[PDB]
Design a protein around this ligand. Structure first.
Ligand SMILES: CCC(=O)OC[C@H](C)CC[C@H]1O[C@H]2C[C@H]3[C@@H]4CC=C5C[C@@H](O)CC[C@]5(C)[C@H]4CC[C@]3(C)[C@H]2[C@@H]1C
Ligand SMILES: CCC(=O)OC[C@H](C)CC[C@H]1O[C@H]2C[C@H]3[C@@H]4CC=C5C[C@@H](O)CC[C@]5(C)[C@H]4CC[C@]3(C)[C@H]2[C@@H]1C
Lengths: 430, 436
């Protein structure tokens, strides 16, 4: 059918009734095939680096050139500040990929494939037109299914830029049938020996009544650096508007008048930056329209391992593409069988397929005997302390003392990339 | 460099100066590598059919089903009117492909590759997901280089949908460096035995001074059917500053005489052709329905054969080295690979001729529509479609800018010719070399 017919269709009306008093597992609620995406959530990790030049730019800024690497302020006060500005630009550049990509490719936000445990998604940005960049690798892994958790790393060995992070959500419907989404997890970016902790924002899905879903961001994201500098990004919705403020240190963040820079605009369009309070002098900071996302290289389907997302989901995606409710169910049953047998083969080969490239670490003050614990000078702990960030499994961005942090009965388990596990990988390639 | 550095760069400042000193045409001003596109103008013909379902929809509308194939008006008065609304939707859907594709893929409008004479670009939309569609074929050919003229046909044998057209431009800069572009040519769409004449609009390239070029449509396009029905599409850049762009108003009339009076519009369509538009029937203006939302159906790109299987006349293969040099931004390699292309094509033409292969007028021929045709010219056939539909529209049959009406100032230019390029299907059926 034409999308102009979706909202008043029998299928949509039925769907709306099924969410009107929804209970249970949103991933397992039947939906009309028109609102199904063929893309799994393990693929979403790619959205952290679809502007390779922005991802790598902070690594090119040093004590001898920093004033030449701050386009909005050639009189920037320090290379640390120059690198904070570049990291903030990179972070803002990720949002359109994160939150708009399905609108562009599918026509609206849709219901993603719910990844199987052990599912992998890998590829590389070869950066062939910029040999100083070198190749950047993505590894994404579904480390939990109950509930869905995706862990990921994106790393450029040539420039010593590495990212790792994980993501999970908790979602429910409002009375108005907006889907309220809380993100959980965090991402760390290391630029040589300097680190950044990034927290994703809460969001909600609008447009469900009219069968044209889309994301609207809310709340705040943080970017806390090992240099002390802190970026606070506040999302409002005029559509997709934010404001981001950079502070000398985290304590200054209670007072906006102490912001070194203030960025405002739309994360899906243009934003401007003002230094100090010089409101009459703003410059263009980032314009998402001007810089096309660059998609990573993923190997041909013929060459993929059966754990790899697109190969694994291929028949299901075909059954979605042509709309057959029963073929969708049949192919899903077949994936469950395929994976059951594949797991047995992995275990026979001594492969920790559930914890393939990531392990889960227990940051509780007092961890359980047996648990993996953080190393002495753990980066997350140092940055979370600087930000006054909860180190518990609270929603992303929760501060110490907040309602979700005060809970006794809340774990502090976080997924961490283990590079040696990838270096020893014997099945998956790029 | 970052795009924010383009406008103040030495390169751009030099480039803007070359514009006043500009004399020649576009493919003279050498322009900096950052404002070059690696895509030839022969590929632009594909923009007429990147929504295959909308291209073919009118063929599915008949006397027994028309009220079920008119989403915005299940009480539509006739199947002819149903088909006119469908063709209008199709035409509107083309515009985002035609005018926004490079903004999307390159970050701005950029200078396309100027096609060589004889250059070809072919492909097909296989429509694998919908077997009742059948394959739709694109043939695009550069029929002139002095000046650049691209001719094209897009055809679906299964459903008897065929399109043919040609395009060329005249461009001029204003003192402020707006590029005024007049389109010339027209496009015919045949839906079984029913025909439609489509005229493209004039435009400006804005944003040159700040090195972020973009197209802004202006003026009017027409869609004149053999059924008498007429759509007039008026384009507007109103609301720039507020972030509005790409707006239009389209009105469908019983015939061209009625079109002299906006109150006689059967329907009125208004909105953004790169976004959403609504339709009102009659003047029931207190109620509208969604007509088209370009955001909801992504363009579908045609299938092109792998580079290593292309003939050396085919655009992507032909321009491959130049395209790679542009992606690298390498000025000297761009000029060197261009010089190589001219050598390659010069030799290729000699080979084509040695084998008796017409390469200059391969699938299209030029027909003289003047009352007194040049001796030896090809002339139109008895009940020519263009002549009939131009007569219904009161459109000039001369080489005036697209959409010029009989008696307009441009219709009166002295000495003006009336030569129009036409597809010759038999020439493709008998093609000696190229395949899909
Ligand atoms: C049965 C489906 C249903 O309940 O309603 C379907 C609604 C029509 C759609 C709800 C889904 O919308 C998807 C949007 C997804 C988020 C988009 C981007 C990100 C960023 C990435 O870095 C982490 C994942 C995250 C937060 C996605 C999570 C899954 C979301 C909310 C999908 C909704 C289930
Ligand atoms: C030398 C470069 C120069 O002079 O100015 C550079 C400006 C920054 C860019 C000028 C170019 O902009 C391009 C836009 C092109 C039109 C876009 C779409 C269509 C639709 C299609 O169906 C027929 C062709 C047409 C009219 C294109 C014609 C060529 C245009 C105007 C390009 C300009 C050279």
């Amino acid at each position: 059918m034409d999308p102009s017919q979706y909202a008043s269709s029998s299928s949509w009306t039925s769907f709306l009734k099924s969410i009107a008093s929804f209970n249970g597992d949103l991933s397992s609620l039947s939906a009309p095939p028109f609102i199904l995406s063929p893309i799994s959530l393990t693929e979403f990790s790619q959205y952290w680096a679809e502007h390779p030049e922005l991802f790598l730019e902070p690594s090119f800024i040093n004590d001898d050139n920093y004033k030449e690497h701050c386009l909005i302020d050639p009189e920037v006060e320090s290379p640390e500040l120059a690198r904070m500005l570049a990291v903030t630009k990179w972070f803002i550049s990720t949002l359109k990929s994160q939150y708009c990509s399905r609108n562009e490719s599918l026509g609206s936000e849709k219901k993603p494939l719910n990844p199987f445990l052990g599912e992998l998604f890998v590829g590389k940005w070869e950066n062939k037109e910029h040999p100083e960049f070198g190749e950047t690798v993505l590894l994404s892994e579904q480390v939990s299914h109950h509930p869905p958790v995706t862990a990921f790393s994106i790393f450029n060995d040539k420039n010593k830029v590495k990212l790792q992070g994980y993501n999970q959500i908790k979602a429910s419907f409002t009375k108005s049938l907006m889907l309220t989404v809380k993100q959980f997890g965090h991402t760390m970016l290391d630029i040589k020996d300097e680190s950044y902790l990034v927290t994703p924002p809460p969001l909600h899905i609008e447009g469900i009544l009219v069968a044209s879903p889309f994301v609207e961001l809310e709340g705040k994201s943080y970017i806390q650096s090992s240099t002390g500098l802190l970026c606070v990004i506040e999302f409002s919705g005029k559509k997709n508007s934010f404001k981001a403020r950079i502070y000398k240190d985290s304590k200054d963040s209670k007072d906006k008048e102490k912001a070194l820079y203030t960025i405002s605009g739309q994360w899906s369009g243009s934003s401007k930056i003002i230094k100090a309070n010089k409101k009459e002098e703003s410059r263009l900071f980032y314009d998402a329209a001007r810089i096309p996302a660059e998609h990573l290289n993923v190997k041909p389907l013929e060459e993929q391992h059966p754990l790899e997302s697109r190969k694994a989901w291929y028949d299901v995606a075909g059954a979605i593409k042509l709309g057959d409710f029963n073929l969708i169910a049949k192919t899903k049953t077949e994936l469950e069988e395929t994976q059951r047998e594949l797991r047995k083969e992995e275990e026979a080969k001594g492969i920790s397929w559930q914890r393939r490239w990531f392990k889960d670490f227990d940051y509780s003050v007092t961890p359980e005997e047996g648990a993996l614990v953080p190393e002495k000078d753990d980066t997350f702990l140092k940055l979370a302390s600087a930000l006054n960030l909860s180190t518990k499994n609270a929603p992303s961005g929760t501060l110490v003392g907040d309602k979700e942090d005060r809970k006794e009965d809340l774990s502090s388990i976080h997924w961490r990339f283990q590079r040696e596990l990838w270096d020893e990988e014997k099945e998956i390639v790029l």
